[PDB]
Amino acid sequence: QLQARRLDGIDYNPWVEFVKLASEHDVVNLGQGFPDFPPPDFAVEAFQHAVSGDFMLNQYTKTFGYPPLTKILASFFGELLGQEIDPLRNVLVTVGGYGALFTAFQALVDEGDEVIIIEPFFDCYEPMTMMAGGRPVFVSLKPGPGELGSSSNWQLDPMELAGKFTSRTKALVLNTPNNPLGKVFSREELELVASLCQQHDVVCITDEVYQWMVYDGHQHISIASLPGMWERTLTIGSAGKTFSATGWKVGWVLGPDHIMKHLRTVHQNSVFHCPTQSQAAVAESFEREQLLFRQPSSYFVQFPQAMQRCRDHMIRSLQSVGLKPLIPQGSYFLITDISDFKRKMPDLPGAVDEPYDRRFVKWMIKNKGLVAIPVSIFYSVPHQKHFDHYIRFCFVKDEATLQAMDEKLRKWKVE
Amino acid sequence: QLQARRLDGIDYNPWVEFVKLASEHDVVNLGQGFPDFPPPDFAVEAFQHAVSGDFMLNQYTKTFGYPPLTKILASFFGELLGQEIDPLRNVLVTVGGYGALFTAFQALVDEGDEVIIIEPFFDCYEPMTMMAGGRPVFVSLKPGPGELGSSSNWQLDPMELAGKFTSRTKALVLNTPNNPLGKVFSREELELVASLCQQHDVVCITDEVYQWMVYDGHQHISIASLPGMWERTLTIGSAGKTFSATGWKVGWVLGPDHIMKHLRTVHQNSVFHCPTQSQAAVAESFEREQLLFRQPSSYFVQFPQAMQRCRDHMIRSLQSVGLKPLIPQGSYFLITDISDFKRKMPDLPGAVDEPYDRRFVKWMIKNKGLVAIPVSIFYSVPHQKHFDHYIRFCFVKDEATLQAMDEKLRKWKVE
Ligand SMILES: *Cc1c(COP(=O)(O)O)cnc(C)c1O
Ligand SMILES: *Cc1c(COP(=O)(O)O)cnc(C)c1O
Ligand SMILES: N[C@@H](Cc1ccccc1)C(=O)O
Ligand SMILES: N[C@@H](Cc1ccccc1)C(=O)O
């Protein structure tokens, strides 16, 4: 009654409960979606330059983006998407990719509108939809029929997907690479999704914050570069996952003027300006990355290789301890199947109809000194019972952390 | 139809049209609500320190605030308000005071709710209310019955104010010191407002971004320090107006847990984190200001004195050219009565039923080389006809700017 109905349901945040049980133990922390090593030197230094240069950089910049940043966004992303991107009509800088999503949802989703969300989903898609009056409509990526799995075998059933569309579908949220699965959507998969979007005339909010974290030669493709798609896609990105600087909380949306003009209204009636100096640091960091595009020494080349190594490392470590990893083609994350521990150990300390993975993650934190995130926080509530056997690890870590993890894992092994 | 109804009306932004007519002339810019000199050294250096210190500061901080910043906010503001402020239950760091307002409005205002807005009002109060489904209800500060006016003579008629309250009033937006008037609400005025708020059980969103810019010995008082008021006030502030660093876009809301828990839901479903390093810079800048509280050398002492000088300077300059200044007790701004020019010059190039002040500001920009902001952008549309004779100047400026202004003003004088 004091508060607005838009807040009904969405008030519960799984984060906080867990990342507070973590702090009351000696743990190797692998549930955190951020690096624990520094950003690359050229980007820190870019921040350093923007806070020590033209003093007017301490003041307000332009409402829809710091112009050097919208310039490099238009240019680099225009080239990657193969699109004529106008910085002033097609680019909006936002408070991280999170603020970008929020802006998008507030612009487009209204009482009645359905938003197709593909599980496992970054958890905020659902509450943001709900705050906007929409009705989430879920579809599940289903794993295919070795022993170690693969993210790319998680299938988007074409018939099941097509069935989700009604005349009330406003938007489909596509997240690639996917958090927490690490699926990198194929071209065929993208075409599938594009196909229905054109057909039913539906916007595709597409969260590509992990664009650059792709492994094993898999290729990040943007649904917006697909024929006819720009006119109906919003493409979100994040400086933080791009330059390993998550506390910079800069992101952007690219998309066509007839959509973006709504995003801009929300922006101008919510935050109005983004901080100036972060924008400057990000503009200079993209400049440095475009200069060196494809090159052995570009961050978008070395970083994925390094993190591919960390991934490979984690996969091996968790495997030999009973966990069944799903090799990701991208993102910061891999998930592991715990179905074996569920048989081995079915009753665990945990509240009433708490899904297994949640009860398991608590167990592990206490006894074995390791943080993961239960995957069920990324399923609609009705699907948590069926999808309660996965947990989510972050391998974007310092080597000292992989070391400490192995220490934890060997102490475990002796059981 | 593609976009959400919450965007109806609110899409028009007076800013942009004007600050683009400005850039196509040689102008002294006085419509900008930000300094054009640097922030104080200790605050720039605080930024410099947070972007070159513990590298983990490049990563995510806590959702509701960087803890060193919520610590100093609780402590300093607790002391100023005379209130026990818990950082975790009573403080939320937001994307500037703008993001704070937005958070507040999204938390509390719902279809039906009325929000009492006092004119002249910072323009966003109205559209934010509207996006939230609310119904702005207006009241006007009316100037009293010398020749030069005074902001403190603009009166909040007690009977007129009381009449605005219905059973549908959710919130009253109090802005003190006031943008664009520079009114510093008296204690009696505050008690008036408090009185009705307690009586009708209404929240008082109170925008105190100008807290420290008070002149002539006038005292900034917070409605929240008034008896019984904390339980029903939200107090917003901004690092940018506090430390002359508007592009830092850090702000906060203080208020009681039973209200703030809603602000937090909006926050966690909108931005989730604020950038880390700005927070660090602001925490250290408050630390430096509290250390030196009241002291000759504290920024909260010298800065108001300096800006009081700039104010005094502008008042004299604009006076002798026909403009009738209203001396502000606070804020960055003074407004001047142009009623004389309206008689002197009634027909001006400007669209159809454009209020006079808007047409006047355009005229001045072209011919006389000076930027102001028409005050009518801060009145409800039905009241613009009656309140079309004021324009708004920003005196928070470098001396080189006051110089150039005088140059413009003397070239003018020869007419
Ligand atoms: C981390 C993450 C975000 C948030 O990006 P920020 O720049 O931190 O706002 C958005 N989407 C996904 C899928 C993420 O993993
Ligand atoms: C400038 C201003 C704001 C905005 O504060 P930011 O920290 O820039 O968000 C809010 N309210 C008033 C009355 C202002 O003048
Ligand atoms: N996305 C990262 C971090 C994050 C958490 C909550 C909001 C935004 C980003 C994760 O899944 O751990
Ligand atoms: N508040 C200042 C600057 C500002 C403009 C628009 C949004 C937020 C802050 C002004 O009135 O000029």
Short mmCIF file of C-alpha atoms and ligand atoms in Angstrom, two decimals, chain A residues 60, chain B residues 96-98 122 125 175 179 207 209-210 238 241 249-250, ligand 2:
data_model
loop_
_atom_site.label_atom_id
_atom_site.label_comp_id
_atom_site.label_asym_id
_atom_site.label_seq_id
_atom_site.Cartn_x
_atom_site.Cartn_y
_atom_site.Cartn_z
CA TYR A 60 28.32 17.03 -16.96
CA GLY B 96 23.25 11.30 -8.83
CA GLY B 97 20.42 13.03 -7.08
CA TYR B 98 18.52 12.53 -10.40
CA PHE B 122 13.00 21.37 -10.99
CA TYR B 125 9.47 16.20 -10.77
CA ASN B 175 13.31 21.15 -2.94
CA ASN B 179 16.06 25.33 -8.23
CA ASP B 207 15.67 17.25 -2.79
CA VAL B 209 21.22 18.78 -3.56
CA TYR B 210 21.97 22.46 -2.85
CA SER B 238 24.31 14.95 -4.78
CA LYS B 241 26.58 20.03 -6.30
CA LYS B 249 26.89 11.62 -10.95
CA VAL B 250 26.91 10.19 -7.45
C1 LIG C 2 21.21 19.42 -10.70
C2 LIG C 2 20.02 18.99 -9.86
C3 LIG C 2 19.76 17.63 -9.62
C4 LIG C 2 20.61 16.56 -10.17
O1 LIG C 2 21.64 16.04 -9.36
P1 LIG C 2 22.65 15.04 -10.06
O2 LIG C 2 23.56 14.64 -8.95
O3 LIG C 2 23.17 15.85 -11.19
O4 LIG C 2 21.79 13.90 -10.38
C5 LIG C 2 18.70 17.20 -8.87
N1 LIG C 2 17.86 18.15 -8.32
C6 LIG C 2 18.06 19.52 -8.51
C7 LIG C 2 17.06 20.42 -7.85
C8 LIG C 2 19.16 19.95 -9.29
O5 LIG C 2 19.40 21.15 -9.51
#
